[PDB]
Design an enzyme around this catalytic site. Structure first.
Site, short mmCIF file in Angstrom:
data_model
loop_
_atom_site.label_atom_id
_atom_site.label_comp_id
_atom_site.label_asym_id
_atom_site.label_seq_id
_atom_site.Cartn_x
_atom_site.Cartn_y
_atom_site.Cartn_z
N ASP A 68 -15.08 -16.38 -19.50
CA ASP A 68 -15.43 -17.55 -20.28
C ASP A 68 -14.34 -18.60 -20.12
O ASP A 68 -13.15 -18.27 -20.12
CB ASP A 68 -15.60 -17.18 -21.76
CG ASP A 68 -17.03 -16.88 -22.12
OD1 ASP A 68 -17.84 -17.82 -22.23
OD2 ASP A 68 -17.36 -15.68 -22.29
N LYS A 96 -25.32 -25.80 -30.62
CA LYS A 96 -24.46 -26.68 -29.83
C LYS A 96 -24.23 -28.03 -30.51
O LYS A 96 -24.05 -29.05 -29.84
CB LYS A 96 -25.03 -26.89 -28.42
CG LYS A 96 -24.51 -25.91 -27.38
CD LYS A 96 -24.73 -26.43 -25.97
CE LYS A 96 -25.47 -25.42 -25.10
NZ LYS A 96 -24.66 -24.21 -24.84
N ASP A 150 -15.95 -12.68 -27.24
CA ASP A 150 -15.20 -12.91 -28.48
C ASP A 150 -16.13 -13.21 -29.65
O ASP A 150 -15.74 -13.92 -30.58
CB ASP A 150 -14.19 -14.04 -28.32
CG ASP A 150 -14.83 -15.33 -27.85
OD1 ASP A 150 -15.42 -16.05 -28.69
OD2 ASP A 150 -14.74 -15.64 -26.65
N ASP A 178 -21.96 -11.63 -28.17
CA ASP A 178 -21.49 -11.09 -26.90
C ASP A 178 -21.39 -9.57 -26.91
O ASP A 178 -20.98 -8.99 -25.90
CB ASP A 178 -20.11 -11.67 -26.55
CG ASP A 178 -20.05 -13.17 -26.73
OD1 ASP A 178 -20.85 -13.71 -27.52
OD2 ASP A 178 -19.19 -13.81 -26.09
#
Ligand SMILES: Nc1ncnc2c1ncn2[C@@H]1O[C@H](COP(=O)(O)OP(=O)(O)CP(=O)(O)O)[C@@H](O)[C@H]1O
Ligand code: NA
Ligand code: NA
Lengths: 298, 214, 929, 139
Positions: C328, C439, C669, C673
């Site tokens: 990432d 987002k 993290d 995930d």
């Protein structure tokens, strides 16, 4: 380059500051290793082409150990050379004489120890630390005995060359070893050089431990500054820096194990060190307008 | 496949060379160390088929043969024709030598008189282990008890050596026939010549069991 | 029996805590002292010396007790039957007892050493708890949680103790610990069910808060909690288990054959039995598993001082077989230390700089567009200055929150200043937190202005996701319609500012009409009613997130080591590609299809994709890509960037990478995930900024959140396969010196060079040699220049290793022991030419006239003191020679007539140590010699 | 090597102006260049042969001494490919360069092998001329 000799209650430090202008901005303060000057350590690194984008915005101050400079008179017979911990007490008066308020340190070997001890004593005068080939621990007992044995058997030049360079590059790189052999044996005073080597050998211990989350909130003892640990893949000091990687806060400490590199990474891989130094400096809010390397190349 | 042939074949070359170097720093007349054999143990000849247990039948030539040819072959160099080229040393002395050529004394086979298997009184020779040097002490004498009737510088230097033998004749009389006679020989009258041990039952003493099948 | 039926005032009465600041430290310390640590859960264990009983027993160590007991029984029978018993069977029993005692001591020490480090690894990352004490948010160690605290749990947070929820902004907990259900169950401060295990106001110990935020009063800490009141093969281990099984079979075959041959050769029953059990328990590779564990634990300790915390030893060997890393960008590949470089409120690159004086370059608050953008950035941020270090400069300050938010807050403080007072003027009504799925993040505030419409809207997020919901602009303080004349300029600004690898965030604001939204209008986070569409765009914000100082070097090491680096990021395909080129993920040469459609001018649809070895995949294109379409991307491209990709697509990415037979290491993290972290061969979590859920799902923790630390861990784990073979080839060398004496005995008919007691003594001294062979190891200079190891084809043990270990380094130790035997028999009189066919009379107890080569005649008990001297010399010589060989090997490369001892067995080493250097067998076996 | 002489930026001019009869073959290198490390042993075993009195071999680190990189027109930038550079100093003045710099200022790529140094620098003829002339100085 303005050269200053500063009376410092432990001798006199010779400093050569290039790019005189200053302000509320830190300068770059460098300390060398044993067998070297600021010229033998950082003069082909700050003259590197990629490095010229970082030296127009920062002042560079080059510190010489007392007597390990160019054209230095021999110290009197049995002069009490300052310890590694009295060498770090000579830096605050260097900063006050040059009107510096803060520094970013680059140290190699003994210079890394001196700059780390200085940043431990006075954390308010240091923002970042680039520590190359740093040994935070004392020599020990087996290593102490081997040093006492090699002191009489081997020359000081070969001792320092084996300290700096690894076994493979002591044979492969002809011009590096044949350059630094003359550097050690012809540009340094050989009485003061052994004095510095003796003071570095009995260097005590850097009292640093890694802060444990939670329970270790009692007192802690570590550098409260952005640290960049630099070591080559084929250097004799890999284990020393890895020991220094621990005993340091991982939040602000970085370890760079440079590949295809040897004893002195600032002279054999300066392009790969300039890029790391640029990103290290940009992480703390400096030179934000400098384009990313390998991007401006394309 | 055959890669080990070259490796092992030349691996012995270093082993042979190290063996050779070791073999050229030794003498051929004296061992480098000799403390394990400090005193000479005793032994009985001929050596039986079993644990020092003689067993023969008087009414058979083959039963007592296996000992008779053994004794004859062993006692061949002791005969009269094969001892005429040695100096006669004084009796009761401590004959030594220092010359570049060493010669032993004469041991006449007539010393071991009377081999009695057919008669009923078998004769077995009790010998003594040879030790290079080790001069005997006091009065060496082999004491054999059940009627029992008793009667060095190296292989290269002392060539021609004929060790002193002792022949033990255990008579099988009609009143005591077919018994298992167990004799206990032992060196007597000596100090260096040891005779007492716990595990070493042969250092000085030999115990054999002679038995005639009636 | 809980307090889920109590009132809010009753909680204060029962626990004596204010439900806005919690109990202060003054009473927290007292309550901690009275009850003890929060998470007690004390497990019982072995009393330690009981483990010593298992070490001095079991396995093949009981064969030696069988032998010792048989020897003692035979001694008892012999003593009862025959007077003055032979004190040899007692010595035999005692020796086979002390041998096992010493071996068990060795094994116990070797296992405690590994256990100490393995338990040391569990304290480097303790569990944390956020308690509200003294009216401030602190982060105490989870064991300090006190009954009555005020614990706040965010998303992906382990719940420290039984909490009675008093506030919950959409909180859902994973209650799979007591139920079997994995669906997140919502938590509210409201009574819902009589059963405390099915009510919404209780959150339990050890559960995870997988989404949202909450706050509660601790009710049960240690064992009164509901959790405390109720109570696998890997290729390397499989290979070393199969090898040990086959070698044990060989050992039993050899032992039985030797026992039979001894019985044929007139051995005693007890002597031959002890010989068989001394051959079997000397040929088996006991301690190989302990040596393997020692190697794994030592190398896990080595790569923990380099910030690579492994949660198990199975991840130590997987890290080293890695051939793909899905990383990432933010935090891992970039420092997450963000600084503003240029501004975009007008259609121009508005530069910015530090050094507050002179305003930094040339610009100030002249522009009303800049004023509005600054207000938007200040209001939308949640990060605030820490109440300390006031005398320090603004940039050198401590700010808690998102890095971009901190950079924006520092920027607003440097430019305008007093962002806290600016936020105080505009009181926040509602707040929508940022999500990796949304987002964006918006807030509604109150406007203390003159011409304000009484409601203020503040928005920030992805610039392209913001422009799509904006219909107006603001240029020089004036609103104009949106057209292409500005859209091309905005895209050019994103291309130039984003093409420098600078993170750009789109900020926009719409004046909420007063006639539609009165003073007391309903504002709810769920079922939003505000006009999200048709906003006034007030410009973007361009700031840098520099690559980590050691990351380009790490990407170079990965490139030279054959490891594929894939960047999975949520940033724009422009910023992501720029950062990929800046860190070296997309190297010089290789160009994207969009780059080779512009180097020479043709439409992108006319370009053959096979000409491009690099690609940038938009996350919205991966959502409509089949398994066969992602396969053509992962194998036809050597450099892949997944931009605008959500954390939930990393599972698809790792699955597609694993369908190619790769060993994938993934970075995570967050809670979303977790399935990727559990699917990947190595799951890597972040030790600084990482959830308690990702730290559970992972097999590895990054104590520094550095991509370079992953590569360092791979480099350290690559040194396992070359150190394990140095142990499997050192446990096997001593076997041939132990069995060749008897073979030569039988064949050449010579006095025995080595006996059973000395056979069992040889493997004692040579038992720790492979253990000390791993604490003094070295690292190769080309470990990071080799291609990844294929765990299904690369075998630790092969014929080239077994054949070498036996027939090249055991047949030259056997000769070095045979030398000592031959010489000790030679100094006493017996010459090697004589010592042939002598074993028939040498071993005859009734032949006490064995003729020395120098003419002497030896008694049986005098021959068998020289024989036992030869046995003991053989044992000592072999043991000391193996130890000195270890020292000489790991020092040089990577007295009275005692020339026959250890000297020759080191000399024979010299010859083959040198001669073997000439063969250079390529498919190399000169590393050992 | 006690045959290659390493120069500073003071000594190089001293020992190029010391004798005008002497031919000096000086290599301009930098310790960070990987091409100079490849040419390091070739220069050593070239000086091991052509080390007559009238032909000595020299070296200078232009990565550290930047006043030599300017007076002798050797570019230390890593994008110029001017390192290593071999210069012949017949009579104290430059007589030949490798790699050669064209009109544009770009160095023409040159392979620094042993067989390419004797041929293009005429080392076999310089050796003979120097070893024939040196005997006249002792007469
Ligand atoms: N606090 C915040 N408020 C609003 N938008 C934010 C934000 N923090 C990040 N973003 C935006 O969210 C988008 C995606 O963020 P996300 O967390 O999914 O990946 P990322 O931007 O953190 C990089 P990576 O995935 O490598 O860590 C980006 O366009 C970013 O600008
Ligand atoms: Na064993
Ligand atoms: Na073994």
């Amino acid at each position: 380059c303005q050269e200053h000799d500063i009376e410092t209650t432990h001798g006199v430090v010779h400093v050569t500051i290039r790019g005189l202008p200053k302000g509320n901005r830190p300068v770059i303060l460098t300390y060398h290793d044993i067998g070297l000057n600021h010229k033998s350590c950082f003069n082909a690194f700050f003259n590197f082409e990629d490095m010229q984008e970082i030296t127009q915005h920062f002042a560079v101050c080059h510190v010489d150990a007392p007597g390990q400079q160019e054209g230095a008179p021999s110290f009197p017979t049995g002069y009490q050379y300052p310890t590694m911990d009295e060498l770090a007490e000579m830096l605050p008066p260097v900063l006050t004489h040059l009107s510096l308020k803060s520094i970013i340190g680059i140290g190699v070997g003994a210079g890394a120890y001196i700059l780390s001890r200085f940043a431990l004593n006075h954390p308010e005068l240091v923002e970042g630390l680039v520590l190359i080939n740093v040994d935070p621990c004392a020599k020990g007992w087996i290593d102490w005995a081997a040093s006492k044995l090699s002191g009489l058997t081997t020359n000081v030049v070969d001792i320092i060359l084996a300290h700096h360079f690894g076994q493979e590059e002591l044979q492969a790189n002809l011009d590096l070893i044949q350059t630094y052999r003359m550097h050690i044996a012809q540009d340094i005073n050989q009485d003061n050089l052994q004095l510095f080597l003796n003071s570095y050998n009995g260097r005590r211990d850097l009292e640093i431990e890694r802060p444990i989350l939670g329970q270790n909130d009692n007192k802690s003892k570590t550098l409260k500054c952005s640290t960049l640990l630099v070591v080559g893949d084929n250097s004799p000091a890999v284990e020393a820096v890895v020991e220094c990687n621990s005993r340091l806060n991982p939040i602000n400490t970085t370890l760079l194990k440079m590949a295809d590199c040897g004893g002195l990474p600032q002279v054999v891989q300066p392009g790969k060190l300039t890029e790391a130094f640029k990103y290290f400096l940009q992480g703390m809010g400096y030179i934000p307008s400098a384009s990313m390397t390998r991007l401006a190349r394309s | 496949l055959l890669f080990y042939l070259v490796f092992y074949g030349f691996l012995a070359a270093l082993f042979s060379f190290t063996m050779w170097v070791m073999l050229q720093t030794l003498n051929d007349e004296v061992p480098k160390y000799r403390d394990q054999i400090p005193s000479p143990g005793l032994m009985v000849f001929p050596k039986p088929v079993t644990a020092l247990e003689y067993t023969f039948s008087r009414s058979d030539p083959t039963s007592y043969a296996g000992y008779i040819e053994d004794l004859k072959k062993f006692l061949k160099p002791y005969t009269l024709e094969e001892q005429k080229n040695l100096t006669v040393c004084p009796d009761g002395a401590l004959f030594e030598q220092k010359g570049p050529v060493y010669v032993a004394c004469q041991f006449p086979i007539s010393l071991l008189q009377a081999f009695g298997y057919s008669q009923g009184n078998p004769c077995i020779l009790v010998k003594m282990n040879r030790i290079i040097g080790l001069k005997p002490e006091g009065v060496p004498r082999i004491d054999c008890v059940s009627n029992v009737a008793v009667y060095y510088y190296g292989k290269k230097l002392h060539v021609g050596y004929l060790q002193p033998l002792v022949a033990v004749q255990v008579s099988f009389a009609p009143n005591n026939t077919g018994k298992e006679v167990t004799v206990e020989c032992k060196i007597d009258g000596s100090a260096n010549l040891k005779s007492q041990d716990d595990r070493d039952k042969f250092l000085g003493r030999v115990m054999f069991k002679i038995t005639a099948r009636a | 029996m809980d307090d889920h039926k109590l009132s809010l005032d009753e909680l204060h009465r029962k626990y004596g805590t204010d439900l806005s600041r919690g109990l202060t430290s003054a009473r927290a310390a007292e309550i901690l002292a009275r009850d003890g640590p929060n998470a007690l859960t004390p497990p019982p264990t072995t009393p330690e010396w009981i483990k010593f009983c298992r070490q001095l027993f079991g396995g093949f160590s009981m064969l030696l007790w069988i032998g010792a007991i048989l020897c003692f029984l035979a001694y008892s029978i012999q003593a009862a039957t025959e007077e003055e018993p032979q004190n040899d069977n007692l010595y035999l029993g005692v020796v086979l007892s002390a041998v096992v005692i010493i071996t068990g001591c060795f094994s116990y020490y070797q296992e405690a050493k590994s256990s100490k480090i393995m338990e040391s690894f569990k304290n480097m990352v303790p569990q944390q708890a956020l308690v509200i004490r003294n009216g401030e948010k602190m982060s105490i160690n989870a064991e300090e949680v006190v009954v009555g605290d005020l614990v706040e749990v965010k998303g992906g947070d382990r719940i420290p103790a039984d909490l009675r929820i008093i506030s919950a902004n959409g909180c859902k907990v994973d209650n799979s610990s007591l139920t079997g259900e994995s669906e997140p169950q919502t938590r509210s401060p409201d009574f819902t069910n009589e059963n405390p295990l099915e009510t919404r106001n209780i959150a339990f110990f050890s559960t995870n808060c997988v989404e949202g935020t909450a706050r509660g009063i601790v009710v049960y800490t240690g064992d009164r909690t509901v959790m405390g009141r109720i109570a696998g093969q890997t290729p390397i281990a499989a290979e070393i288990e199969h090898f040990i099984h086959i070698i044990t079979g060989v050992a039993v075959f050899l032992g039985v054959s030797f026992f039979i041959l001894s019985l044929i050769l007139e051995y005693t029953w007890l002597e031959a039995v002890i010989f068989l059990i001394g051959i079997i328990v000397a040929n088996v590779p006991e301690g190989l598993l302990a040596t393997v564990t020692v190697c794994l634990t030592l190398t896990a300790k080595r790569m923990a001082r380099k910030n690579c915390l492994v949660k198990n030893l199975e991840a130590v060997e997987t890290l080293g077989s890695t051939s793909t890393i899905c990383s990432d960008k933010t935090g891992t590949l970039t420092q997450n230390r963000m600084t503003v470089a240029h501004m975009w409120f007008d259609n121009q690159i508005h530069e910015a700089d530090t050094t507050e004086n002179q305003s930094g370059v040339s610009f100030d608050k002249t522009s009303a567009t800049w004023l509005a953008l600054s207000r938007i950035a200040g209001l939308c941020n949640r990060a605030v200055f820490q109440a300390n270090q006031e005398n320090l400069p603004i940039l050198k300050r401590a700010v808690a929150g998102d890095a971009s938010e901190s950079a924006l807050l520092k920027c607003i403080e440097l430019c305008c200043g007093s962002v806290k007072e600016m936020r105080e003027r505009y009181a926040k009504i509602v707040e929508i937190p940022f999500n990796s799925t949304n987002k964006y993040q918006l807030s509604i505030h109150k406007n203390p202005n003159t011409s304000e419409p009484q409601h203020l809207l503040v928005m920030k997020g992805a610039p392209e996701r913001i422009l799509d919901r904006c219909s107006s602009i603001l240029l020089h303080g004036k609103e104009q319609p949106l057209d292409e004349e500005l859209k091309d300029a905005f895209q050019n600004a994103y291309l130039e500012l984003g093409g420098l690898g600078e993170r750009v965030l789109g900020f926009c604001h719409l004046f909420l009409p007063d006639e539609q939204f009165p003073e007391g209008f309903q504002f709810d986070t769920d079922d939003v009613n505000f006009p999200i569409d048709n906003l006034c765009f007030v410009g973007l914000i361009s700031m840098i997130d520099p690559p980590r100082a050691a990351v380009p070097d790490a990407v170079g090491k990965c490139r030279s080591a054959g490891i594929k680096v894939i960047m999975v990021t949520g940033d724009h395909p422009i910023t992501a590609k720029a950062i990929a080129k800046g860190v070296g993920i997309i190297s010089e040469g290789n160009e994207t299809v969009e780059d080779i459609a512009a180097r020479l001018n043709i439409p992108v649809s006319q370009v053959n994709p096979r000409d491009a070895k690099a690609c940038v995949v938009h996350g919205s294109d991966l959502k409509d890509m089949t398994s066969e379409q992602l396969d053509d991307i992962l194998k036809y491209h050597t450099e892949i960037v997944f931009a605008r990709t959500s954390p939930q697509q990393k599972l698809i990415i790792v699955e597609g990478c694993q369908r190619q037979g790769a060993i994938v290491a993934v970075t995570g993290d967050g809670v979303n995930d977790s399935p990727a972290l559990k699917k990947a061969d190595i799951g890597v979590a972040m030790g600084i900024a990482g959830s308690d859920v990702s730290k559970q799902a992972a097999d590895m923790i990054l104590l520094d959140d550095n991509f370079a630390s992953i590569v360092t861990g791979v480099e350290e784990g690559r040194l396992i396969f070359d150190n394990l073979k140095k142990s499997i080839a050192y446990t096997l060398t001593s076997n041939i010196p132990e069995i060749t004496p008897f073979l030569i005995f039988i064949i050449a008919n010579i006095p025995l060079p080595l006996g059973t007691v000395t056979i069992l003594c040889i493997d004692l001294g040579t038992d720790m040699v492979p253990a000390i062979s791993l604490a003094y190891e070295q690292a190769e200079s080309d470990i990071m220049k080799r291609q990844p190891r294929n765990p299904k084809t690369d075998k630790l043990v092969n014929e080239r290793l077994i054949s070498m270990a036996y027939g090249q380094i055991g047949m030259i130790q056997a000769l070095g022991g045979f030398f000592t035997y031959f010489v000790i028999l030679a100094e006493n009189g017996f010459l090697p030419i004589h010592l042939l066919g002598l074993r028939v009379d040498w071993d005859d107890r009734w032949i006490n006239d064995v003729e020395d080569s120098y003419g002497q005649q030896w008694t049986y008990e005098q021959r068998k003191i020289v024989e036992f001297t030869c046995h003991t010399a053989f044992f000592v010589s072999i043991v000391v020679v193996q130890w000195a060989d270890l020292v000489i090997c790991k020092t040089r490369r990577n007295p009275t007539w005692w020339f026959c001892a250890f000297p020759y067995s080191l000399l024979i080493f010299v010859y083959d140590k040198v001669r073997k250097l000439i063969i250079r067998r390529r498919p190399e076996k000169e590393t050992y010699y | 090597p006690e045959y290659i002489k390493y120069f500073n930026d003071k000594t190089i001019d001293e020992e190029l102006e010391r004798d005008k009869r002497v031919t000096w073959i000086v290599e301009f290198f930098a310790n960070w260049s990987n091409d100079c490390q490849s040419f390091a042993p070739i220069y050593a075993d070239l000086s091991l042969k052509y080390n007559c009195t009238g032909l000595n071999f020299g070296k200078v680190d232009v990565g550290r001494y930047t006043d030599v990189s300017t007076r002798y027109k050797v570019s230390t930038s890593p994008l110029t490919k001017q390192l290593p550079t071999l210069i012949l100093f017949q009579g104290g003045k430059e007589a030949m360069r490798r790699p050669q710099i064209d009109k544009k200022g770009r160095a023409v790529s040159w392979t620094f092998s042993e067989e390419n140094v004797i041929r293009e620098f005429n080392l076999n003829e310089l050796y003979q001329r120097a070893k024939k002339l040196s005997k006249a100085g002792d007469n």
